[PDB]
Amino acid sequence: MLQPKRTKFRKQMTGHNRGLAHRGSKVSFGEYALKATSRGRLTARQIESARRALTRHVKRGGKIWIRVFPDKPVTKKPLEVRMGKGKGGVEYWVAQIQPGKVLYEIEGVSEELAREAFALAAAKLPLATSFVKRTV
Amino acid sequence: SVKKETRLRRARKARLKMRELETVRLCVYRSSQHIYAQVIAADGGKVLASASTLDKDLREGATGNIDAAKKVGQLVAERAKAAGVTQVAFDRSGFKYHGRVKALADAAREGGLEF
Amino acid sequence: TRNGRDSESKRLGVKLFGGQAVKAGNILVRLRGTKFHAGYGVGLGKDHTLFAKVDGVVKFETKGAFGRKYVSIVAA
Amino acid sequence: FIVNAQVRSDLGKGASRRLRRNAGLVPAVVYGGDKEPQSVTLELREIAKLLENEAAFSHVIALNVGGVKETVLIKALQRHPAKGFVMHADFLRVVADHKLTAHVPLHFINEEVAVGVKQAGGEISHTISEVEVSCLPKDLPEFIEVDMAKVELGQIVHLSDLKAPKGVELVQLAHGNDLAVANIHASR
RNA sequence: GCUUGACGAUCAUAGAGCGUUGGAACCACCUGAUCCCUUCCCGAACUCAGAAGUGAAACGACGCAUCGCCGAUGGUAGUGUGGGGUCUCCCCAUGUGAGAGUAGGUCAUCGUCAAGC
RNA sequence: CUCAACGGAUAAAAGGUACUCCGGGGAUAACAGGCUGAUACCGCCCAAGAGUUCAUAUCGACGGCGGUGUUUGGCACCUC
RNA sequence: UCCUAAAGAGUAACGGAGGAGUACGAAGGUGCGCUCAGACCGGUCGGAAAUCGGUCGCAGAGUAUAAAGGCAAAAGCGCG
RNA sequence: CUCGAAAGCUAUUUAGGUAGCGCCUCAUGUAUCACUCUGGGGGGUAGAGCACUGUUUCGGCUAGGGGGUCAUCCCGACUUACCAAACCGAUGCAAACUCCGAAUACCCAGAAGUGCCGAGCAUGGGAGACACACGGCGGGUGCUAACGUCCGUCGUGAAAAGGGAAACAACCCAGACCGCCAGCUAAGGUCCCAAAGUUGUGGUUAAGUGGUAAACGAUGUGGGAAGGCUUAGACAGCUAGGAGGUUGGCUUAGAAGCAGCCACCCUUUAAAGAAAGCGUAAUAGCUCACUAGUCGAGUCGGCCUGCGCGGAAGAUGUAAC
């Protein structure tokens, strides 16, 4: 799916996900957008699954922007493995998202079809999202 | 310039050493025209007095030679005998120690002005 | 492919902060390469340790071009 | 366009945060000119009905605190990132003889009769709306028209290809950064 | 008194970028290396006998504000303490409080010293 | 020289025990209990799709959200 | 040596990243001399690129060695 | 009777032992100490930022290879269908990034007051400890799982009883010298078990919600802003609805308004989708809009927010007030 092509380090910490998305919150490239209203994580096959629901529902045209990008490595321990024998290996990638972050954007589409497209997209996402328009 | 900065690229260490150390300073000027001298005392920023080669006694025409550099060695020295230090320190100032630079300098040692 | 082996944590930093009385030998900044520079009466040791060479109080000015953070001691 | 306003003689974090949840107000300021900035409180019910209008930002909007009135401009409104309501409207004044920079929205009128839409199959690509201008206040436009009745499949209309009210300086043409305003592109 | 020197206070509100100039004093060249020497080969380096020439280049002050650089107010994020909640997070009281952004200054402000007008 | 087990037991140091013995421990494993639920198991949500037409009679890719404590774990809390 | 480490020190994990068990009689002192890299280009053997000649340069170079922190009053080379 | 720890750091053939230092006590000296205020002072974390080292995403741009290439037995090359690092702008994100940058904490100086009569320090006598626990906060590790585990910093238990949380080391309140059949409060409570309001005013909720729960789903109801249709008569309900030629398509029991294939306006004139789809699976019966005389009215959709409803299955017995 969506990875960085390289990374400086193979592992990050766990970290936290605090604050609001004061950046990433405006519809910067399209006319309509799926903005998240709750915080969470998107495991890069939630990214692609909602992307495939969008492009398939429009069926004629329009340009679609993917504003989110999974950049941090997430590491699991396998089974039959005791705690603490070094940090486990990377499995997937995750974008840390805040309330207010624009996830997807679209143009060239009617306002009734964009709501029907981002409702297909939001059902494949573990977030509480919303539909927004371009403001100014 | 290519000339004025590359000597102030060389005039760098003693520039700021004698303000750390607070001792006497001899802000001279040489050129293809002239050979000057002017002295600053033991604090980095105090002018003593001035003495040019535009001074009243030797504007005779061969101004600023190595003949006319040894005339400057006893010249600002009398102006620094109202100052009150025996030794005096050497601004190289990007003026390479081969010509009028030392001939103002080494004529001060006989001229009551020690290094 | 194996991690461990951190070092033993050299205790660097500004000792004797910027209003304090000094005596004329005091280590004034332990330092890993002159993050602070040498002002009026301070010394700059071999490993860039700043040390007071006179008595007084330490000032911590910012001065000059290059944005040097200076440590100078004023005999007050 | 008229806004009612009040005095707002108490400032801070927890004060401004309790106007929004108890009183239902928004904080604001007018500051612009060579004059004294003034803190202003204002109602959220009426500032959202002004932002309903298509020409909210690129239009002289009247405002009164009491009997005092000003030719006011909306300069850099602030917004809740999550729920999208207005906090801190942040207005300007108008001194009627300087250049008074603002944002002016776009129209893109002739999109049905386009040589890259009709004959050759292509769709439009809005890259930029709401260009930021600098114009004397009597020549403060609501709109800037963008004509796309001759752009072909592959042709790019820039801001160099743009237009009207002629007394309106575009800020991006003042530098070498010429911006691409729309496209007609082949479909996916 | 101004022109300009000579090291310095202050350090991109002082910085770069686009015209006019100064010849007398200063300043760069210039004429050449004979007598000092400079050369990883050289007098453009630099050492100089110099003052035959020259003010454009060279630099110097002196022009002009696009750009960098400073930058309010107000808000916001954060946060010490005390208390809540639906507690991987926020809210309330209270104290504090940015960063980024938002009219625009400006071809800076100083200090001693001197030859000349 | 050699203490790299790098504050260096001695100049000089490998194993077996299912034939075992003693002193202790639930400061610590195996069984079972407990905490948790990755894992397993069972539901549910959107529905690209197949179902000869027709998403929802059956089935459902991509992802989503929960429940049960039902076993593989993880923990070492009780029990040597 | 950096991170974790919570803007004074310090601070754990079979946590995440790399290194050392030396070099140097000059690679030190000092005297003296002296300042990068980059794109831009000139093809008869190198033509992405050298020899380097000179135009816009705007530390991005270099430091015996890891990383951090530092530098021009050089904290790189030449030579006595 | 008075005081009162620690379960830390460093070293260890050491890890449940020990040693020095920290913490306790006693004695003897001696003059500091704490809190707060005002004043100095460094910082690079939170946040934020993209100027650096990296990672992002989409507009724009130049060289060039030459994919395409009229191709000259071999040149000149038309030409930009492929593409092309860098540059311009817009847009993200880092523990090992920083042009920036706090609150707090820490260091210092000077001050009032308070200190239980001392707090601080120094030398000596005696120790004990050197397996900590849980809770809040700030993080690593794990699955931002665990009454998991490793640090920082607090509070508590250890070593602290009493009242509350039904019961419940570690949570909330509060720190018990002894007596009292005195009174005020704290947390928490006031219908009965059970001490105190069946207290007052104003609302909400019909589920026993209260008194366990997620995506998501519904004319459940309360409140609030707005909008379009609104008596020239709207949304669900009545007695006129109806084109003047000649197969709009490669198919041939059988191919409209629903087959792997797609769709926007010309009248005798007040008159209307060469169509979004349940139909007598298909053809000879029939359903969302009226530029309208006639029955005559307040409606139809969304958003914000209050409390509720399904989603909701478990093993001894009601059994999560």
Which residues in chain D (24-53) have CB-CB distances under 8 A to chain A?
Answer: none
- Say whether A108 and D57 touch across the interface (CB within 8 A): no
Burial of D70 (0-12, 13-18, 19+ CB in 10 A): buried
What is the radius of gyration, based on Cα positions, of chain D? Answer: 20
Whole-angstrom distance, CA of residue D125 vs CA of residue D105: 16
- CA nearest neighbour of A69 among A9, A11, A2: A2
- Do A61 and D123 form a contact (C-beta atoms < 8 A)? yes
Tokens (6 digits) for D158: 């820039």
Which residue type, as a one-letter code, is found at position D179? L
Q: Long-range contacts for B5-9 (Cβ within 8 Å, ≥24 apart)?
A: B6/B94, B7/B93, B7/B94, B7/B95, B8/B94, B9/B94
State the method: cryo-EM
SS3 D69: strand
CATH code of residue A64: 3.90.1170.10
Strand segments (E) across B4-89:
25-26, 37-40, 47-51
CB proximity A61 to D under 8 Å: yes
Determine the longest span between alpha carbons in chain D, in angstroms. 63
Residues on chain D touching A99 (C-beta within 8 angstroms)? 81-82
Helix axes A111-122, A45-58, angle to 10 degrees: 150
The token duo for D187 is 């479909």
Residues from chain D that touch A22, judged by Cβ atoms under 8 A, are 81
Number of domains in chain A: 1
Chain A environment of D129 (Cβ under 8 Å):
134
Distance (Å, whole) CA D76 – CA D59: 14
Q: What is the DSSP letter of D106?
A: B
Residue with tokens 């005095």: D7
Phi-psi region of D98 (alpha: psi -120 to 50; beta: other; left: phi over 0): beta
Are D72 and D66 within 8 A, CB to CB? no
Domains parsed from chain D with CATH numbers: 1-94 (no CATH), 95-188 (2.170.120.20)
**10 Å Cβ neighbour count for D33?**
13
**Backbone phi, then psi, for B110, in 5-degree steps?**
-75, -30
Residue A99 in any domain: the answer is yes
Residue showing tokens 């001279």: B28
Subunits in contact with chain A (3 or more CB pairs closer than 8 Å): D
Residue A128 lies in a domain: yes
Q: Would you give the DSSP letter of residue C31?
A: -
Chain E: positions less than 7 Å from a protein CB are 5-12, 25-30, 36-38, 45-51, 58-59, 66-67, 72-79, 88-97, 99, 101-104, 111-116
The topology under which CATH files domain C13-74 is OB fold (Dihydrolipoamide Acetyltransferase, E2P) (2.40.50)
Tokens of C26: 């005091």
Query: Which residues fall within 8 angstroms of residue B59, CB to CB, at 6 or more apart?
Result: B53
For strands C56-58 and C21-22, give the pairing.
antiparallel
Residue recorded with tokens 């996900």: A17
Total Cβ atoms within 10 A of residue A40:
17
- Does A9 contact strand G, using a CB cutoff of 7 Å? yes
Alpha-carbon distance of C66 to C37, in angstroms, equals 11
Which residues form the domain of B68? 1-115
Distance CA A108, CA C36 (A): 59
How distant, in Å, are the alpha carbons of B48, C36, C53, C76 from that of C73? Answer: 28, 13, 9, 9
Looking at the 3D structure of chain B, how many domains does it have? 1
Are β-strands C37-38 and C68-71 bridged in parallel, bridged antiparallel, or unpaired? parallel
Please give the resolution of this entry in Å, rounded to 1 decimal. 2.9
Tokens of C72: 């100078």
Cβ–Cβ of A60/D187 closer than 8 Å? yes
The separation between the first and the last C-alpha atoms of chain B, rounded to the nearest angstrom, is 32
Q: Can you tell me the distance from the alpha carbon of D52 to that of D49, in angstroms, rounded to the nearest whole number?
A: 5
DSSP designation for A88 = P
> Is C49 within 7 A of strand G by CB distance?
no
Residue A13 domain-assigned (yes or no): no
Using an 8 Å Cβ cutoff, are B71 and B61 in contact? no
CB within 8 A of A83, min separation 6: which ones? A77
Please, which positions of strand H sit below 7 A from a protein CB?
39-43, 46-49, 53-61, 88-97, 107-109, 139-146, 148-149, 215-216, 225-227, 304-305
Q: Measure the CA dihedral B90/B95/B97/B103, to 10°.
A: -70
At D30, give phi and psi (nearest 5°): -110, 135
Among B70, B80, B72, B91, which residue's Cα sits nearest to residue B114?
B80
Q: What are phi and psi of A55, to 5 degrees?
A: -60, -30
User: Touching check for A66 and chain D: CB below 8 Å?
Assistant: no
Residue ranges making up the domain that contains A78: 20-135
